[PDB]
PDB file of N, CA and C in Angstrom:
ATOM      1  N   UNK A 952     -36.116  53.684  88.835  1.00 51.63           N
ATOM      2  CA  UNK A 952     -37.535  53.855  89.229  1.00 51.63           C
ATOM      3  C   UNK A 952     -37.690  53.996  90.727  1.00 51.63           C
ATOM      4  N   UNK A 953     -38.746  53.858  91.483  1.00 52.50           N
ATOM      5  CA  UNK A 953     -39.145  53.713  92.604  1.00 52.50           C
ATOM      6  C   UNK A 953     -38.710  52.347  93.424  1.00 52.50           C
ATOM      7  N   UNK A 954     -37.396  52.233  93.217  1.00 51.08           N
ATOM      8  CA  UNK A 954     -37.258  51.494  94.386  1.00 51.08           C
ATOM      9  C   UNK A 954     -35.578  51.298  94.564  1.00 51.08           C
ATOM     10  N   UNK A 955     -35.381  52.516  95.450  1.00 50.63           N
ATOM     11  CA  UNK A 955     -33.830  52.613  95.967  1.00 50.63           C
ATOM     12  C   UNK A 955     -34.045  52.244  97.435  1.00 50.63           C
ATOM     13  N   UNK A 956     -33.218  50.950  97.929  1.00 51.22           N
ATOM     14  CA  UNK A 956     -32.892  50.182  99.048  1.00 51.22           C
ATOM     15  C   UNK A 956     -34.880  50.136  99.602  1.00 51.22           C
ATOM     16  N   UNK A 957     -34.783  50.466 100.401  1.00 51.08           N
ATOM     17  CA  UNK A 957     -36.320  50.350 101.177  1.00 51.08           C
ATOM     18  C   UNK A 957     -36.517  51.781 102.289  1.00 51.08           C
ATOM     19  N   UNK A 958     -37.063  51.085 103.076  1.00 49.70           N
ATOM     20  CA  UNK A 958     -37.469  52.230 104.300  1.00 49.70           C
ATOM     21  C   UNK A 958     -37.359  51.744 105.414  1.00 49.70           C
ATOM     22  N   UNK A 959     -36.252  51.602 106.172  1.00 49.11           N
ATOM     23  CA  UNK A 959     -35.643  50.676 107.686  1.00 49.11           C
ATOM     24  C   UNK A 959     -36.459  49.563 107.996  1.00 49.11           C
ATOM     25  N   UNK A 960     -36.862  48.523 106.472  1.00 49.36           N
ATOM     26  CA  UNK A 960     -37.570  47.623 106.735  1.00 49.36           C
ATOM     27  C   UNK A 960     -36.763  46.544 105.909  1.00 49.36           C
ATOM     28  N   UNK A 961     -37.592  45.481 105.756  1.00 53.16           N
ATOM     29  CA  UNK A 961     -37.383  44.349 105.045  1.00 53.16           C
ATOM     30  C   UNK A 961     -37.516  44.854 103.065  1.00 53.16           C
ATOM     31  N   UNK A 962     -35.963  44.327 102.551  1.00 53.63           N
ATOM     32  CA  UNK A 962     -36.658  44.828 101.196  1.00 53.63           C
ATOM     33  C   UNK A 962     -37.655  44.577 100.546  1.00 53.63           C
ATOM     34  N   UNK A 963     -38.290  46.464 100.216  1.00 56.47           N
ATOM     35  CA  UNK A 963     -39.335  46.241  99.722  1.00 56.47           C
ATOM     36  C   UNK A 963     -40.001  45.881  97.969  1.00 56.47           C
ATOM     37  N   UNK A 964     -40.758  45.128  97.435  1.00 53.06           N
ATOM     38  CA  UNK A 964     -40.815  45.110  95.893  1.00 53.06           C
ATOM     39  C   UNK A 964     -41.788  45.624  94.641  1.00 53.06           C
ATOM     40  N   UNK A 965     -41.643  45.955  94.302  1.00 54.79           N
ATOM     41  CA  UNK A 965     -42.491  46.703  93.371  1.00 54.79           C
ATOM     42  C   UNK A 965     -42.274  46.001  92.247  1.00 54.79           C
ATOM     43  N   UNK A 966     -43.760  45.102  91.538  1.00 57.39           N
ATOM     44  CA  UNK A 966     -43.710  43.958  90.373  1.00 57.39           C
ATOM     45  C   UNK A 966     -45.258  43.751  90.356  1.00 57.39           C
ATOM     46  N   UNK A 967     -45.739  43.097  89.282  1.00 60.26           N
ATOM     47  CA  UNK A 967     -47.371  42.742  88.847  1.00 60.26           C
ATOM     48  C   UNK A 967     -47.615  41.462  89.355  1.00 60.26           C
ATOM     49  N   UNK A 968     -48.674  41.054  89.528  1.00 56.73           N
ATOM     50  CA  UNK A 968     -49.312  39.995  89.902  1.00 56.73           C
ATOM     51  C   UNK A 968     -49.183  39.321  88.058  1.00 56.73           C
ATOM     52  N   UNK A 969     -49.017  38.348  88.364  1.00 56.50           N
ATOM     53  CA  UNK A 969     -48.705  37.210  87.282  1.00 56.50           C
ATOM     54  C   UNK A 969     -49.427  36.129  87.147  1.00 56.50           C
ATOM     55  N   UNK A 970     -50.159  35.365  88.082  1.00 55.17           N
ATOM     56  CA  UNK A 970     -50.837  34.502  88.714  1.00 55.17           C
ATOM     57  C   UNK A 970     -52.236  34.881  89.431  1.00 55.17           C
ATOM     58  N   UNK A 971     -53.100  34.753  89.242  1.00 55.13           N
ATOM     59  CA  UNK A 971     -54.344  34.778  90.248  1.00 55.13           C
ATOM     60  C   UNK A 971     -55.493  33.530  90.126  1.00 55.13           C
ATOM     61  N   UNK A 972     -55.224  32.566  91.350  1.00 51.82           N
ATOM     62  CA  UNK A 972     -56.473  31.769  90.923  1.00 51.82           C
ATOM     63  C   UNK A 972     -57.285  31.769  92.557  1.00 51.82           C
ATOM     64  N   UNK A 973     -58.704  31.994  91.772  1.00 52.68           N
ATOM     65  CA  UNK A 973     -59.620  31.851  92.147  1.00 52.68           C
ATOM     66  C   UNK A 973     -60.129  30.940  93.375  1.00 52.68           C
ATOM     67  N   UNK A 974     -59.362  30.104  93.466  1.00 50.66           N
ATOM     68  CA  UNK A 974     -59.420  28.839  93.471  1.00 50.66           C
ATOM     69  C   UNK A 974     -59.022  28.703  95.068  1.00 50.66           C
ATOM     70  N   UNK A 975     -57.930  29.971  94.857  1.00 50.71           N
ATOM     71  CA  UNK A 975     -56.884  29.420  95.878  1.00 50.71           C
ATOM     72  C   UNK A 975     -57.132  31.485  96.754  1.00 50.71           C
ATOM     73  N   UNK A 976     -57.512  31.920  95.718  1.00 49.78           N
ATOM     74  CA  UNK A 976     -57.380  33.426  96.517  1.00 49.78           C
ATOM     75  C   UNK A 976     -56.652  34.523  97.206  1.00 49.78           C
ATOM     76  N   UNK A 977     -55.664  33.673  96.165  1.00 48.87           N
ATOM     77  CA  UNK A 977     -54.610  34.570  96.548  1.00 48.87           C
ATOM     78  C   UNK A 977     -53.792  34.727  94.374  1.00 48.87           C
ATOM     79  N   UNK A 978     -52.389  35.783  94.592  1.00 51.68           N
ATOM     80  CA  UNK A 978     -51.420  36.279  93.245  1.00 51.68           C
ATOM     81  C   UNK A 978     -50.247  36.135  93.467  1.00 51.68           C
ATOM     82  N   UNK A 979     -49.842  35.750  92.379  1.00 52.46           N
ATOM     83  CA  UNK A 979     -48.172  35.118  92.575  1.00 52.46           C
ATOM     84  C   UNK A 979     -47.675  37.192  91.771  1.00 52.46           C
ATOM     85  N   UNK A 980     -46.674  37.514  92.110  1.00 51.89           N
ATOM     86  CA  UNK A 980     -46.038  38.204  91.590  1.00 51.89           C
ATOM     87  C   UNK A 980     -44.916  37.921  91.211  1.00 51.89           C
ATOM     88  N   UNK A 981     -44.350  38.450  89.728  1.00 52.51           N
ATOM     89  CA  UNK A 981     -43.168  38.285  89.122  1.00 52.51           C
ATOM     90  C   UNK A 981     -42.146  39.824  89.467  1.00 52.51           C
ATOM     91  N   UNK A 982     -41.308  39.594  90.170  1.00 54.40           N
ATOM     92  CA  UNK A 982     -40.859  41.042  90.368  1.00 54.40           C
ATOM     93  C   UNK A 982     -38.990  40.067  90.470  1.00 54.40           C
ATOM     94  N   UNK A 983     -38.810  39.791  89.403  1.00 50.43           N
ATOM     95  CA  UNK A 983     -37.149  38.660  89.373  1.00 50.43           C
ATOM     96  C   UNK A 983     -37.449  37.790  90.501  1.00 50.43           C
ATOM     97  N   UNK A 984     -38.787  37.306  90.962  1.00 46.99           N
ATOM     98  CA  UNK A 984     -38.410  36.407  91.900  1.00 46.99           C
ATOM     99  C   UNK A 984     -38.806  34.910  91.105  1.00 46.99           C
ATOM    100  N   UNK A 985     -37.629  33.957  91.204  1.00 46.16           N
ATOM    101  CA  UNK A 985     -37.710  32.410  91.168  1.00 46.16           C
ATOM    102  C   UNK A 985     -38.644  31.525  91.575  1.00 46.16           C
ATOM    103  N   UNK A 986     -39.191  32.198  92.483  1.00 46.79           N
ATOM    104  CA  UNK A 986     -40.503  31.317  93.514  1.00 46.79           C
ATOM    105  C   UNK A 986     -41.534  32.302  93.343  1.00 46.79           C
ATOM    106  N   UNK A 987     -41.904  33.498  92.895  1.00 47.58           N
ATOM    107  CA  UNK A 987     -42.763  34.733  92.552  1.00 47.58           C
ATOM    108  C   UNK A 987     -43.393  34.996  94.084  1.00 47.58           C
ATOM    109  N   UNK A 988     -43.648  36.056  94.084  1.00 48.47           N
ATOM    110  CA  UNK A 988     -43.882  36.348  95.501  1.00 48.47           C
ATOM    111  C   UNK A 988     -45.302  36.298  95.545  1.00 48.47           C
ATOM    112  N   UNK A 989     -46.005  35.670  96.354  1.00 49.86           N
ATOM    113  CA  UNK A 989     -47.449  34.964  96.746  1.00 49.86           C
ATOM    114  C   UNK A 989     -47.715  36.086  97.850  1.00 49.86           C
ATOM    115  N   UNK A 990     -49.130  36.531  97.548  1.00 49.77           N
ATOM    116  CA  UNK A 990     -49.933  37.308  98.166  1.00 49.77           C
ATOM    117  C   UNK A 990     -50.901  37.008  98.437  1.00 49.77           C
ATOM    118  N   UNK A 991     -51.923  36.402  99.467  1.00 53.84           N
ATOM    119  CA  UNK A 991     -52.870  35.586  99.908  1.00 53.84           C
ATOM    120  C   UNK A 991     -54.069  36.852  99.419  1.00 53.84           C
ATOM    121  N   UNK A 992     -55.462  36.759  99.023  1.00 53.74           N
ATOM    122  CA  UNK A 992     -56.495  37.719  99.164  1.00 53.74           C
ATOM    123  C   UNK A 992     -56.891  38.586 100.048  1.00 53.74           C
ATOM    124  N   UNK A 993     -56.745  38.086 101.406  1.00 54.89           N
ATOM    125  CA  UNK A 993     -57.319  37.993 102.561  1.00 54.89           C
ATOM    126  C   UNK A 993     -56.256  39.122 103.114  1.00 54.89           C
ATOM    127  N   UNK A 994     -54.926  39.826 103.080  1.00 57.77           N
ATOM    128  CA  UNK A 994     -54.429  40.401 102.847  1.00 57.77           C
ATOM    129  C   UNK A 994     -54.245  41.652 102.196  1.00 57.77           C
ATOM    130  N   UNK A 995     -55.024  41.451 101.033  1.00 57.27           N
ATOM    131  CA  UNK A 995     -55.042  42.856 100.014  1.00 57.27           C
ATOM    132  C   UNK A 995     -55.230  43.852 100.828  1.00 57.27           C
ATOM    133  N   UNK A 996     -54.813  44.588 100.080  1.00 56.55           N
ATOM    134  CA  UNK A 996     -54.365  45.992 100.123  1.00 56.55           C
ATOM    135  C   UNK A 996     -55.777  47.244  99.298  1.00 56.55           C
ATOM    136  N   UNK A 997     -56.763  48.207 100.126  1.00 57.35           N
ATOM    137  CA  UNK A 997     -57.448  49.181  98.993  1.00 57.35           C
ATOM    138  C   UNK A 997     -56.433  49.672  97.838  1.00 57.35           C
ATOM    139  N   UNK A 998     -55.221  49.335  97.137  1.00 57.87           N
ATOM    140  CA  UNK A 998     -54.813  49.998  96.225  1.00 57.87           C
ATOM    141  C   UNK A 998     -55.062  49.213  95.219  1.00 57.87           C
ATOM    142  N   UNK A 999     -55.255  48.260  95.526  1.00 57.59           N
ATOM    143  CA  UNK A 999     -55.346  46.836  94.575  1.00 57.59           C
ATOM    144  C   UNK A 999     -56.949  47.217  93.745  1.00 57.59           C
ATOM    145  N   UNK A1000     -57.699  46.667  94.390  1.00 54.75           N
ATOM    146  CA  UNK A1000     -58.814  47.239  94.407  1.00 54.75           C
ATOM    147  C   UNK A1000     -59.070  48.676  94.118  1.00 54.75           C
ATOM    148  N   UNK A1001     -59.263  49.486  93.407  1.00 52.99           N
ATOM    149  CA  UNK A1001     -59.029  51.128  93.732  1.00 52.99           C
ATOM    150  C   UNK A1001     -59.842  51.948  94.510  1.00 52.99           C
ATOM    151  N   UNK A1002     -59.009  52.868  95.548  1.00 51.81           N
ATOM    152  CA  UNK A1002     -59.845  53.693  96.291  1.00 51.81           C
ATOM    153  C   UNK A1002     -60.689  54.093  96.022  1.00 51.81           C
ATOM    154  N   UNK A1003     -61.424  54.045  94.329  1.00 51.26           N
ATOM    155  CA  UNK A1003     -62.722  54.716  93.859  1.00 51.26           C
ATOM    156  C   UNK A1003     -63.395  53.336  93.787  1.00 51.26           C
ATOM    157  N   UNK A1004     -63.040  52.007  94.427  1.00 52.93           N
ATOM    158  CA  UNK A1004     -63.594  51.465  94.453  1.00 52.93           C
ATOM    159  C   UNK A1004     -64.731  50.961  95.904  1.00 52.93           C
ATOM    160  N   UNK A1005     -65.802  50.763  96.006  1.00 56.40           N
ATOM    161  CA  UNK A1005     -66.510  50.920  97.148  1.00 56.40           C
ATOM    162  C   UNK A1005     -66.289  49.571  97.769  1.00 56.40           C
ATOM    163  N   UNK A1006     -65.449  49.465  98.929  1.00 56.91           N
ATOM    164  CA  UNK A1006     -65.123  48.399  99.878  1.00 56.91           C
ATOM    165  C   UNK A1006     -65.491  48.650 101.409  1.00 56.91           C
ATOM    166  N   UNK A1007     -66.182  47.922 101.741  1.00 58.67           N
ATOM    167  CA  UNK A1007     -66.787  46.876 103.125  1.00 58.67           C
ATOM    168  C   UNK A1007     -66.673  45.672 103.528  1.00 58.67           C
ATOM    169  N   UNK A1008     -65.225  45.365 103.964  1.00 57.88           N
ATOM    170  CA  UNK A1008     -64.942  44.201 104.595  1.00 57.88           C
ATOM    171  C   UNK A1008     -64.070  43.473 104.033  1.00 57.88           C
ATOM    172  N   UNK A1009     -64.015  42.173 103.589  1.00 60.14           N
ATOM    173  CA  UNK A1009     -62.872  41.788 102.612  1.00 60.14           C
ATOM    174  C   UNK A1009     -63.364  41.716 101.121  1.00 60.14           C
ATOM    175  N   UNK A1010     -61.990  42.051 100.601  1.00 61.93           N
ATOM    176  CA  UNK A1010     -61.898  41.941  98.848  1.00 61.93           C
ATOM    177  C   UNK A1010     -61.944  40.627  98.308  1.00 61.93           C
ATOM    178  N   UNK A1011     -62.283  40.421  96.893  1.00 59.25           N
ATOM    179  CA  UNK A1011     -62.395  39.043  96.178  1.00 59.25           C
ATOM    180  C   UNK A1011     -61.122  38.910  94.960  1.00 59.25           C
ATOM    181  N   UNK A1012     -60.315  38.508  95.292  1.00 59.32           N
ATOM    182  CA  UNK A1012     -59.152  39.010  94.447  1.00 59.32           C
ATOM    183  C   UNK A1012     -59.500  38.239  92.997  1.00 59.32           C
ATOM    184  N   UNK A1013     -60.008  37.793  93.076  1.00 63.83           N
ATOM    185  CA  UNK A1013     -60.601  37.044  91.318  1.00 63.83           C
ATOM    186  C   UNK A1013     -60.728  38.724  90.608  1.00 63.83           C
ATOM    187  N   UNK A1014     -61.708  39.330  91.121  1.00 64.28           N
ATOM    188  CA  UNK A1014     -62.087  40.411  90.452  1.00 64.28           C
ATOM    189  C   UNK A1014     -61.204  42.141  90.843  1.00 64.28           C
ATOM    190  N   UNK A1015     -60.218  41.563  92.311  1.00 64.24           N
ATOM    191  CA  UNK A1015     -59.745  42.677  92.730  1.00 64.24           C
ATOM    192  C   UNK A1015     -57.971  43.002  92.268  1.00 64.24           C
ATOM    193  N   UNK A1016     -57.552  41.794  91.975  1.00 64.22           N
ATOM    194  CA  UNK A1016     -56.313  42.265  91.227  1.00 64.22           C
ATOM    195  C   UNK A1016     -56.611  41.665  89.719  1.00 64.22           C
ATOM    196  N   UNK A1017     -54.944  41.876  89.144  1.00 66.44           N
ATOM    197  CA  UNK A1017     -55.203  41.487  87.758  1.00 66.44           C
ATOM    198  C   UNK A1017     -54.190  41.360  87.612  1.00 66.44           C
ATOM    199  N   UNK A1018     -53.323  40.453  86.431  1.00 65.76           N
ATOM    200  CA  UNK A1018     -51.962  40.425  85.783  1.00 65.76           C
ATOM    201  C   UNK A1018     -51.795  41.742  85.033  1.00 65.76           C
ATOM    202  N   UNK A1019     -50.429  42.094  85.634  1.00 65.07           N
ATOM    203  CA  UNK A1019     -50.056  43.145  85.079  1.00 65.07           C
ATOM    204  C   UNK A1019     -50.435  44.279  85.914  1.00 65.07           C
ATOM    205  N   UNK A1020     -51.113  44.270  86.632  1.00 66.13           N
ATOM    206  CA  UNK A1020     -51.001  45.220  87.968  1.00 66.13           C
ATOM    207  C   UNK A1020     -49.904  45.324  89.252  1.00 66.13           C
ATOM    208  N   UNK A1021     -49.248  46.383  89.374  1.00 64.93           N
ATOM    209  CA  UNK A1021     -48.129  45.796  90.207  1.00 64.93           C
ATOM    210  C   UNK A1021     -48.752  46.316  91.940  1.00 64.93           C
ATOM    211  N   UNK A1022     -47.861  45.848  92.533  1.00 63.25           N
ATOM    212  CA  UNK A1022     -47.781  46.260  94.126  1.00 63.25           C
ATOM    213  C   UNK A1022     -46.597  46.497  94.444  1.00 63.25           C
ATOM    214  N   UNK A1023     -47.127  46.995  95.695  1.00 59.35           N
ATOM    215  CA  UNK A1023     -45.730  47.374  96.860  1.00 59.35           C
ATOM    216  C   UNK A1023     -45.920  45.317  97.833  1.00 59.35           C
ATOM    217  N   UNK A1024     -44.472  45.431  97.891  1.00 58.62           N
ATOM    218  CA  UNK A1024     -44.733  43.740  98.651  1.00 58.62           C
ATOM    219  C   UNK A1024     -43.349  43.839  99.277  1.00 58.62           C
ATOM    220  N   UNK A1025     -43.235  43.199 100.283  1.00 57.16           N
ATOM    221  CA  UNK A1025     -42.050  42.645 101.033  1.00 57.16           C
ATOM    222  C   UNK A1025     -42.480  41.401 101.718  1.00 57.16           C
ATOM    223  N   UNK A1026     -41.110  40.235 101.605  1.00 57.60           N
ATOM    224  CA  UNK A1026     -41.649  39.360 102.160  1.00 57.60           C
ATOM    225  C   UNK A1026     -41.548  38.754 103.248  1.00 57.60           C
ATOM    226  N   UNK A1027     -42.547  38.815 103.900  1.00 55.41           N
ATOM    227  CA  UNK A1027     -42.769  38.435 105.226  1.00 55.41           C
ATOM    228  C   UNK A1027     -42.662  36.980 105.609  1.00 55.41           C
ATOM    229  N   UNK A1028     -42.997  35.574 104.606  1.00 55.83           N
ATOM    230  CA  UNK A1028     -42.803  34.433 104.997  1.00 55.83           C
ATOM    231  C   UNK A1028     -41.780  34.057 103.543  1.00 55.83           C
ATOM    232  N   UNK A1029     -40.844  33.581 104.469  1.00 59.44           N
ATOM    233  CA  UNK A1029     -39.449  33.084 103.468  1.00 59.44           C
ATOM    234  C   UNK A1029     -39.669  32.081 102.563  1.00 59.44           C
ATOM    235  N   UNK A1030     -38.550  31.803 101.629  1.00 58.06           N
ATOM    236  CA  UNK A1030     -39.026  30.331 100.730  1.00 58.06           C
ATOM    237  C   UNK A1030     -38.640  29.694 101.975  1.00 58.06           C
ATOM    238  N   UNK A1031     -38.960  28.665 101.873  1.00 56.09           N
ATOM    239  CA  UNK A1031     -38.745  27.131 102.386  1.00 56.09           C
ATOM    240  C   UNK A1031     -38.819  25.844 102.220  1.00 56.09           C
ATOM    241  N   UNK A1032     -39.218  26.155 100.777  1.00 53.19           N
ATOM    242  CA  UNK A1032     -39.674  25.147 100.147  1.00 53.19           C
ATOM    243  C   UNK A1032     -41.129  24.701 100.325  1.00 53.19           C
ATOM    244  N   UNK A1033     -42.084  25.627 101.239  1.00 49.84           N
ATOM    245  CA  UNK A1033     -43.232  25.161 101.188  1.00 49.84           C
ATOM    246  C   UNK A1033     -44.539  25.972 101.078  1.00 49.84           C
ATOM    247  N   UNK A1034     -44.004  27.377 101.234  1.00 48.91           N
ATOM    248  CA  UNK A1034     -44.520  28.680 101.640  1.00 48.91           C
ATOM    249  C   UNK A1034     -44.166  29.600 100.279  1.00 48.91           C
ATOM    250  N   UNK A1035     -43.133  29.780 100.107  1.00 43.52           N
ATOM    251  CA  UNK A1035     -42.599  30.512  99.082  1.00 43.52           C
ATOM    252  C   UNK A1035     -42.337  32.014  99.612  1.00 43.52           C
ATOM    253  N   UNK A1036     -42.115  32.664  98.601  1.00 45.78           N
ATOM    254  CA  UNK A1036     -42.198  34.024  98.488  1.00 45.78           C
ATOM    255  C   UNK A1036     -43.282  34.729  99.335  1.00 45.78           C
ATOM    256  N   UNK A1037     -43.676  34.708 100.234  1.00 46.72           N
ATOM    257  CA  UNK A1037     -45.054  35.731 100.840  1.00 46.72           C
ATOM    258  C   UNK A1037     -44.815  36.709 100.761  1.00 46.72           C
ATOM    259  N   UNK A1038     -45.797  37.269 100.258  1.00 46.96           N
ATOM    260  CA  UNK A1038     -46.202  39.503 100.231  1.00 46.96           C
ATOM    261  C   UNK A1038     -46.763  39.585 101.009  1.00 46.96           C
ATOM    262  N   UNK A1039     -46.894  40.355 102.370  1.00 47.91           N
ATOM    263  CA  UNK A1039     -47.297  40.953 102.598  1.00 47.91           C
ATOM    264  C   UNK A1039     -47.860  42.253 102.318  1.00 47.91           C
ATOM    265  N   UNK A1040     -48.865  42.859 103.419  1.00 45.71           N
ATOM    266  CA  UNK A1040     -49.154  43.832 102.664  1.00 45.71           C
ATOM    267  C   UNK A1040     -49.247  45.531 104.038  1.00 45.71           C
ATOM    268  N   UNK A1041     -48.251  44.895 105.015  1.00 47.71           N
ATOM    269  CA  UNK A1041     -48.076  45.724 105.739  1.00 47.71           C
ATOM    270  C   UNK A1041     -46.946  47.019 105.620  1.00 47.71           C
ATOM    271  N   UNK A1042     -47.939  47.694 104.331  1.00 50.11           N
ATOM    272  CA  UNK A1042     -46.460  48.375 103.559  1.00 50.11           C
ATOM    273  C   UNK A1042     -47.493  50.008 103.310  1.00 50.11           C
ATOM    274  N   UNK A1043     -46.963  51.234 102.798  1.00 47.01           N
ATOM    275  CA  UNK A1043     -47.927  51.849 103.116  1.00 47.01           C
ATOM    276  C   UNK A1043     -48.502  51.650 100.951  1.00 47.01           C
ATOM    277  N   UNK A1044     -49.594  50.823 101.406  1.00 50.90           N
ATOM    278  CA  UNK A1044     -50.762  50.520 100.329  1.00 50.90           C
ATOM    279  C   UNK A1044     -52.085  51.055 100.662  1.00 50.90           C
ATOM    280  N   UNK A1045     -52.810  51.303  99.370  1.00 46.79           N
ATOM    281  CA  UNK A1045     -54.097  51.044  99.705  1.00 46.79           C
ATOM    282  C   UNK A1045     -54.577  52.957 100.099  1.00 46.79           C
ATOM    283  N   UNK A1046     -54.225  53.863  98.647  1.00 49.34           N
ATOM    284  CA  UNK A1046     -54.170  55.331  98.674  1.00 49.34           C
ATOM    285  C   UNK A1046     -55.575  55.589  99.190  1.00 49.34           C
ATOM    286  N   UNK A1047     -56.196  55.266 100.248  1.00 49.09           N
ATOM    287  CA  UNK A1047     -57.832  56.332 100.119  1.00 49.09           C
ATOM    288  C   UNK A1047     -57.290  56.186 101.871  1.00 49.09           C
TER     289      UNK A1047
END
């Protein structure tokens, strides 16, 4: 599929959000990761959300991702036992 080595970056992952609470505002993704890779809201990406979707300012990821939707993610904050997996989303996301 779409994902041979990366692009002179940090490897990149392609996997669904698995996790989303409300609560906390951010999605765990399952992409073989042990610790699932955590993507804060505040972060998202317009692909998440879809470019036919009308956005001004920040997204509400309760309603803007979903399980079973995947992303582009690389992670930017390591496990450490306290942080986990972080996605970033400085990847090229977010088609409009």
């Amino acid at each position: 599929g779409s994902h041979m080595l990366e692009q002179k970056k940090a490897n990149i992952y392609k996997g669904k959000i698995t996790r989303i609470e409300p609560s906390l505002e951010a999605a765990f993704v399952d992409y073989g990761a042990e610790r699932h890779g955590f993507l804060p809201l505040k972060e998202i990406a317009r692909e998440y959300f879809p470019a036919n979707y009308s956005a001004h300012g920040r997204p509400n990821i309760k309603d803007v991702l979903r399980e079973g939707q995947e992303v582009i993610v690389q992670i930017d904050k390591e496990e450490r036992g306290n942080k986990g997996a972080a996605l970033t989303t400085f990847i090229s996301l977010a088609g409009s």
